[PDB]
Design a protein around this ligand. Structure first.
Ligand SMILES: *[C@@H]1O[C@H](CO)[C@@H](O)[C@H](O)[C@H]1NC(C)=O
Ligand code: NA
Length: 699
């Protein structure tokens, strides 16, 4: 169907041409045409503040007194992702029985929501939002989430709260609850918001406040220009704040000119929570309550955090803070200004700094407490279904489980019946990442299998760990790795296991120490010694990481690839990586014609237009005609033959470290999972939540 008005703006045309759903196209057009007539945005707004401008209203010993009328705090936790045990650890740190906790879990994070429900069922002062939005980065929906949660909280008459504080799963306190309550009790009529403080016209342009945006199909579309309304001062800064009940009441229930028109304006705004509350407060009757300090330390690093990493999500470029590391601990003790929270923290990136901070605030755990240096994070959970996995991860998780079953059989030494022989049943039940002392240890896979001696089903967990493959030879090179999903801000691969299939596009990374600039040669070698790519790269004196994604035609030949680094044909180092053949297509066993198309190498017979056959003799990489033919045979296989090819490849690159039983077992040499040090079933008291103590705490 055609639009209600001629659509000629280049930005709107670009959005309409990229939008996937008919609903989104119609809403894009409806929004554009409304604005074109001048009926969508306000252009003049009343200012109620009696001040000429802004108001901008520290002794370390002032947070040590004991208040007679302590504030009660409503924490709104806006969380997403997989890091449930870290969220539980932070919740333990900030919990007190006289506060309140209201938890919004991103609609797309169903595993995390199930874990949060278990928390809300234990404690009367914890509730979960029954509505759930998909709060994409920069989305307008983040303000809708805050405004709805404020209305909900104001109508819970059994929760008499005095302040509203927002936190994510990557936040952590840097002072005790006692000190937070003492400080807020002394300034209970103030509002804590941090402004950019620099040139305001530049802030408006950098933020895109003079641009019209629309959130639809989990994307933020830019649709054109708009005027800043006259009569008000527009301000902004951090979207992390603390607001008192009186101002939250005004924002929620006022119908005056300011609140009404700003709610309309910010419904079509990028990063609305970074400026909506500043602009309303400063122009409201409450303007003289504003303190230019959000009581947070935010770990900005412009060199690493501003790589326009959200381009596929919003029609704009943005920045995000870095994760703290152990060398940052001294920053949590600064004395310039009062601060009570900090971000960001990620246990999969660095857990040591989280431990240092928690023990600093609340003391060591007793000697003999297990799991303090470990971290477990669920990356697949059965209720979400195998269609939420990929064919690559479904194939490999199956193979890891079979590797565990083979370890159980070979671990029993006996000349009679082997009561540790198993037959696998069904699909993996769960998968965890496992870390120890900030070193990746591999995957834990929970699975079901029949013990063949007694003919009974058993539930097991297998630990698999990747074999070391980086090898140096007689420079500033420290490490080399191949992977996917490179995180330029944290400088690591978010595909932690390096799981790859024939249609993946691998990335080569190098890590360097200090020294003078140098140039090296990178060579990619496929499983039958076909040289797929060669290139030189400059390593500047100041470079720490380098990475590059060669344009290799697909599919890649399955097997063990090798990536070599040379310095003027002198060997430097090498690493290896596995392109796995897939046993599933659309989560069903792969058929002969599917496998042949997928497993016989690139459709162009060559990985790139330029050939490197003249290099094979130079590097002693002869192509064996027998191995080439065997790869053709392997490509046509399915079923049991294909399973044997896959498992021999996986076994060459992964080790089954151990396997345990969750319940009873007829295998005499298998340990109970809860009694191991490594299982996701073993004790982890730092993330466990129990009964409330006499002092009202869980920690
Ligand atoms: C480093 O770079 C400079 C120019 O930037 C170049 O002249 C020099 O040859 C390079 N290598 C060394 C060791 O200086
Ligand atoms: Na509850």
């Amino acid at each position: 169907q055609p639009p209600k008005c001629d659509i000629s703006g280049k930005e709107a045309i670009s959005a309409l041409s990229r939008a996937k759903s008919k609903h989104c196209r119609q809403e894009i057009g409806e929004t554009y045409c409304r604005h074109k007539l001048g009926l969508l945005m306000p252009e003049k707004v009343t200012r109620f503040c009696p001040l000429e401008g802004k108001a901008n209203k520290w002794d370390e010993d002032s947070v040590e007194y004991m208040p007679a009328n302590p504030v009660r705090i409503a924490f709104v936790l806006v969380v997403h992702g997989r890091a449930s045990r870290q969220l539980q650890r932070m919740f333990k740190a900030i919990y007190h029985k006289d506060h309140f906790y209201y938890i919004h879990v991103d609609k797309r994070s169903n595993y995390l929501h199930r874990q949060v429900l278990q928390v809300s069922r234990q404690y009367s002062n914890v509730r979960v939002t029954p509505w759930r939005m998909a709060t994409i980065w920069g989305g307008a929906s983040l303000l809708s989430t805050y405004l709805q949660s404020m209305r909900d909280l104001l109508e819970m008459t059994d929760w008499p709260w005095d302040f509203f504080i927002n936190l994510s799963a990557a936040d952590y306190p840097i002072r005790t609850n006692d000190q937070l309550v003492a400080f807020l009790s002394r300034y209970r009529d103030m509002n804590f918001l941090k402004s950019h403080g620099r040139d305001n016209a530049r802030f408006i342009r950098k933020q895109g406040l003079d641009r019209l945006f629309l959130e639809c199909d989990a994307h933020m579309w830019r649709l054109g220009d708009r005027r800043i309304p006259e009569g008000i001062a527009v301000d902004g800064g951090s979207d992390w704040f603390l607001l008192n009940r009186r101002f939250v009441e005004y924002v929620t229930f006022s119908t005056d000119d300011l609140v009404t028109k700003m709610k309309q304006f910010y419904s079509y705004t990028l990063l609305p929570a970074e400026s909506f509350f500043h602009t309303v407060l400063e122009n409201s009757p409450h303007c003289d309550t504003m303190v230019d300090n959000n009581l947070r330390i935010t770990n900005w690093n412009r060199k690493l955090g501003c790589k326009c990493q959200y381009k596929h999500i919003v029609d704009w470029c943005g920045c995000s803070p870095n994760d703290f590391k152990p060398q940052d601990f001294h920053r949590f003790q600064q004395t310039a200004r009062p601060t009570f929270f900090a971000r960001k923290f990620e246990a999969v990136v660095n857990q040591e700094i989280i431990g240092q901070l928690d023990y600093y605030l609340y003391g060591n755990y007793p000697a003999g407490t297990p799991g303090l240096r470990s971290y477990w994070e669920n990356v697949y959970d059965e209720p979400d279904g195998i269609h939420s996995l990929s064919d690559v991860t479904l194939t490999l998780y199956h193979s890891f489980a079979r590797l565990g079953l083979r370890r159980a059989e070979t671990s029993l030494h006996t000349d009679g019946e082997n009561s540790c022989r198993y037959y696998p049943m069904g699909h993996p039940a769960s998968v965890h990442l496992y870390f120890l002392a900030d070193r990746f240890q591999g995957f834990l896979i929970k699975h079901h299998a029949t013990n063949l001696a007694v003919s009974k089903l058993e539930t097991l967990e297998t630990w698999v760990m990747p074999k070391k493959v980086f090898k140096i030879a007689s420079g500033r090179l420290q490490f080399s790795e191949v992977g996917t999903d490179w995180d330029a801000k944290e400088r690591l691969f978010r595909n932690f296991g390096g799981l790859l299939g024939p249609m993946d596009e691998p990335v080569g990374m190098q890590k360097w120490g200090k020294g003078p600039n140098v140039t090296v040669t990178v060579i990619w070698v496929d499983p039958v010694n076909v040289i797929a790519a060669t290139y030189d790269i400059l390593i500047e004196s100041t470079a720490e990481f380098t990475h590059y994604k060669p344009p290799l035609n697909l599919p890649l030949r399955p097997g063990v690839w090798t990536v070599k680094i040379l310095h003027h044909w002198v060997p430097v180092a090498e690493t290896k990586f596995l392109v796995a053949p897939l046993t599933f297509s659309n989560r069903q066993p792969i058929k002969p014609e599917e496998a042949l198309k997928l497993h016989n190498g690139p459709l162009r017979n060559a990985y790139m237009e330029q050939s490197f056959q003249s290099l094979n003799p130079v590097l002693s990489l002869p192509i064996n005609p027998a191995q080439v033919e065997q790869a053709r045979r392997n490509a046509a296989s399915t079923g049991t033959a294909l399973e044997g090819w896959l498992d021999s490849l996986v076994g060459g690159m992964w080790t089954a470290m151990d396997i345990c039983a969750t319940g009873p077992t007829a295998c005499p040499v298998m340990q109970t999972c809860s009694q191991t040090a490594w299982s996701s079933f073993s004790p982890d008291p730092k993330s466990e939540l129990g009964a409330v103590k006499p002092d009202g705490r869980l920690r």
